[PDB]
Enzyme design. Structure first.
Site: not given
Ligand SMILES: Nc1ncnc2c1ncn2[C@@H]1O[C@H](COP(=O)(O)CP(=O)(O)O)[C@@H](O)[C@H]1O
Ligand code: NA
Ligand SMILES: Nc1ncnc2c1ncn2[C@@H]1O[C@H](COP(=O)(O)CP(=O)(O)O)[C@@H](O)[C@H]1O
Ligand SMILES: [Mg+2]
Ligand SMILES: [Mg+2]
Ligand code: NA
Lengths: 311, 315
Positions: A186, A256, A42-43, A291, A13, A288
Site C-alpha cells: 500500500n 488483504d 495471512g489468514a 461492510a 485474534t 469488502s
Molecule cells: N475507499 C475505497 N473505495 C474503493 N475501493 C477501496 C477503498 N479503499 C480501499 N479500496 C480497495 O482496496 C484495495 C486495497 O486497499 P488499500 O490501498 O487501502 C490497502 P490497506 O489500507 O487496507 O492496507 C484498493 O486497491 C482498492 O481496490
Molecule cells: Na470492510
C-alpha cells in the site's frame, strides 16, 4: 483435493474496544462496545481466496489456548486446509488489541506470540503441498527467516510467489525482492520501503520503479479509493487501474481482500492479463469496504457478479 | 454451606499487553507478551473475602462465551459459590483491555458488557441467598439501578450493606447513601462525590462528614499508604487508622483487597470495633501491595498472622 494457493503467514485474534475518546497515560476509561474477530494478514488473505472458490492451505502457528482452538475452527468454517496449522504451548495465539474512538482514530498493540514460533522445520513438513501449489503467499507478520524459506521453496518448485511486505520495515532483506514474482504493498508501505512521498498515482509509479530495480518482476502499489498502480520488468511504464467509486462502511482489511483475490486469479485464471486480474481484485476489495468487520466483510463467489468468474 | 458474604457486582476478563512504552495516538506498536487475568471490582472483593475463609457467593452476569465459562472456573478455583452467576447470549463477558509499559504505567479501557444486563429478575431469583447473608457488598460497575435494588433487598432483609461507589458518579441517587450501612471509597472517589480536595487525613475528615450527612451510617475513605479515615452517625469525630509501612511492589487492586477484608470482618467478627476491623483490613490490603497482579496478590488466611483472626481486640 490439491491446494492451488498456500499461505504461509499469521493468524491473530483481534480484540476491539470502541470508545468516545482514546485514553491518556494512567487513564482508565469506559468504552461502549467490545468484540473479538479473526484477523492476521495471512489468514485474512487466505479467507478471501477461499471464499472466491480457491482450494487453500494455511501454514501458520497458534497457541494451545482458547483463541488458537477458535482460530482453527474459523479456518475449517471457511473450507481452508489446516493440515499445517500448528499449535504451541510456548506462546499465546497472536493478538491485536485495538482501541477505536467514534471518529475512527486508534491505538493498536500487536503481540505476534505463537506466529513467530512457526519455524523452518514446520515449513519443511509442508514441502509436497507447496510443490503442487500454483501460488505461495507471504507477508511480514511471522519471523522473516520463515517467510524467506517459504519463498525459496516456492521458487525451487516453480511456484509463483506473491509477497506482501506488510507491515513494512525500512531495511527489508534484499532477497524479499529477488524472491518475489509479484510484490504488492500500500502507499504507506511504499513510502517506508523507498523513502519517497506517495500522494498520487504518479508518485506511486516512481516508488514502484525503485522496487522493480531491487529485483521484483511485478510491483503493485494499492492506493485506497484510487485503485492501484502496476508495472513489471516486461512493462516498466506504470499503469493506473482505477476502482469502483463506492460509499465505504469500513476499509479495515481491504488490502488483504485485494491480495487474496489476486492470489485466486493468479492460481485459477492464469490466462487473464495482469490488468484484468487487478481490475477484478480492485472490484472485490471495493465490495469488502462496503461492510463492517474485516473477515466478515469478505465476499463469497455466489454474491459477486458472474463476470468476475468469466474469460 | 450458607454464604455469609454476598457480592452483587462485576466480573471482567483482563486482556493485558506488556510493551516497552505506551503507544502515541494513531500509533501501532509491538508488545512482548499478552496474557488473560481475572478482574472486576465485585469479583476482586469476593476473592479477597473467600481467601480469608469467608463462605461467599458472587451474584453476577457473564457472557454465554469462553471468557464467561473461564470466569466461572476462576470463581470456583477460589472456593466462591457460583450458584447465582448468570450467563447471557445477548452481551459478551465484561472486558478490561490493559496496556502496561516496563515502569508499570498503564492505559485501561473497560467495556462492562454482560455486567450491565444483571437485572431485577436475576436478583429476585437470588432473594434467598441475599436474605440468608450477613453482609451484601456492591459497587458501581453494574447498572446502578441493579446495585440500588440489591441494597434495597439487603436492607429489607436486615442484611448489613457495604457499598463501594466505584467508579464514582458526581450525583448518585440519594438512596445510595440512606441504604448504606458502610460507605467505603478512595481519595479520587471522595473528591468526585464532594467537590473537595482529598489529599491528607485532615481533608478526608471534611469529605467524610459531607458524605455522612447524606445519610450513610458509617463512612470510610481509604488514603493509600496513609491507611484510612472513618466516622459514623454514633461517633461523628473522624478517626485516622494508619497502615503497615511496607515496600510496595504493585498497589493495583489494594482498594478491592481492603473492601473484601472489611466484608469478611463485618460477616465473621461482628463483635469487633470499626477501628479494629479497619486496622486488620488495612494490614491485609498492605500485604496485597507487596505482590504483582491484583487477584493473584490477595493473601490467603494460611499465610497471614494468627492475630488477624482472634475473636477479641488485639493489643
Ligand atoms: N475507499 C475505497 N473505495 C474503493 N475501493 C477501496 C477503498 N479503499 C480501499 N479500496 C480497495 O482496496 C484495495 C486495497 O486497499 P488499500 O490501498 O487501502 C490497502 P490497506 O489500507 O487496507 O492496507 C484498493 O486497491 C482498492 O481496490
Ligand atoms: Na470492510
Ligand atoms: N503503599 C501502600 N502501603 C501500605 N498499604 C497500602 C498502600 N497502598 C494501599 N494500601 C492499603 O490499601 C488500602 C486501599 O488502598 P487505596 O486507598 O490506595 C485505593 P486506590 O486509591 O489505589 O484505589 C489503604 O487504605 C491501605 O490499607
Ligand atoms: Mg486502505
Ligand atoms: Mg492506591
Ligand atoms: Na498487588
Amino acid at each position: 483435493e490439491v491446494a492451488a494457493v498456500v499461505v504461509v503467514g499469521s493468524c491473530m485474534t483481534d480484540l476491539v474496544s470502541l470508545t468516545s475518546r482514546l485514553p491518556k497515560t494512567g487513564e482508565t476509561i469506559h468504552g461502549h462496545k467490545f468484540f473479538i474477530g479473526f484477523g492476521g494478514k495471512g489468514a485474512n488473505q487466505c479467507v478471501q481466496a477461499a471464499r472466491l472458490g480457491a482450494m487453500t492451505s494455511m501454514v501458520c502457528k497458534v497457541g494451545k489456548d482458547s483463541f488458537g482452538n477458535d482460530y482453527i475452527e474459523n479456518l475449517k468454517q471457511n473450507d481452508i486446509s489446516t493440515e499445517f496449522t500448528y499449535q504451541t504451548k510456548d506462546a499465546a495465539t497472536g493478538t491485536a488489541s485495538i482501541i477505536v474512538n467514534n471518529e475512527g482514530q486508534n491505538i493498536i498493540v500487536i503481540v505476534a506470540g505463537a506466529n513467530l514460533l512457526l519455524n523452518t522445520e514446520d515449513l519443511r513438513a509442508a514441502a509436497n503441498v507447496i510443490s503442487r501449489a500454483k501460488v505461495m503467499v507471504c507477508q511480514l507478520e511471522i519471523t522473516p527467516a520463515t517467510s524467506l524459506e517459504a519463498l525459496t521453496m516456492a521458487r525451487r518448485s516453480g511456484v509463483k510467489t506473491l509477497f506482501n511486505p506488510a507491515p513494512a520495515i525500512a531495511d527489508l532483506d534484499p532477497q524479499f525482492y529477488t524472491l518475489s514474482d509479484v510484490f504488492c504493498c500500500n502507499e504507506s508501505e511504499a513510502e517506508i520501503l523507498t523513502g519517497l512521498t506517495v500522494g498520487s498515482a504518479a508518485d506511486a509509479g516512481e516508488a514502484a520503479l525503485v522496487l522493480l530495480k531491487r529485483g521484483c518482476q511485478v510491483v503493485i502499489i494499492t492506493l485506497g479509493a484510487e485503485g492501484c498502480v502496476v508495472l513489471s520488468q516486461t512493462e516498466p511504464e506504470p499503469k493506473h487501474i482505477p476502482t469502483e467509486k463506492v460509499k465505504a462502511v469500513d476499509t479495515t482489511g481491504a488490502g488483504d481482500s485485494f491480495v487474496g483475490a489476486l492470489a485466486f486469479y493468479l492460481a485459477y485464471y492464469p490466462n487473464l492479463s495482469l490488468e484484468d486480474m487487478l481490475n477484478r481484485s480492485n472490484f472485490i476489495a471495493a465490495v469488502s469496504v462496503q461492510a463492517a468487520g474485516t473477515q466478515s466483510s469478505y465476499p463469497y463467489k455466489k454474491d459477486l457478479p458472474l463476470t468476475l468468474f468469466l474469460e
